[PDB]
């Protein structure tokens, strides 16, 4: 909005940190079932806890 509270800004920050894709060294771990992050949120489609 460009007029944020601090509460909201911090919320957004964490959401922004969560988006990154898996580190590829994770795929090489021993008992690995994970191939892709599957919790990736694109701003244009799917619109936050808000």
């Amino acid at each position: 909005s460009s007029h944020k509270t601090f509460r909201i800004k911090r919320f957004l920050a964490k959401k922004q940190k969560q988006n990154r894709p898996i580190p590829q060294w994770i795929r090489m771990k021993t008992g690995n079932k994970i191939r892709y992050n599957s919790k990736r949120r694109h701003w244009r489609r799917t619109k936050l806890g808000l």
Partner: protein
């Protein structure tokens, strides 16, 4: 710098002075959209920033 989010400019100023034996003109904080309070810290004109920068490691 990156600074702890709870800090006042007063605290930062006092920290910067304490750690690096330095002295500050002014501190000028903001908050990164990421979460880490950044701090621009103007040193007083008796001091050169590149000289301290070399002391602390960065360049």
């Amino acid at each position: 710098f990156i600074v702890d989010v709870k800090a006042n400019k007063h605290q930062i100023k006092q920290a910067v002075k304490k750690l690096y034996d330095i002295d500050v003109a002014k501190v000028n904080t903001l908050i990164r959209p990421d979460g880490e309070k950044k701090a621009y810290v103007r040193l007083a004109p008796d001091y050169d920033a590149l000289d301290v920068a070399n002391k602390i490691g960065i360049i």
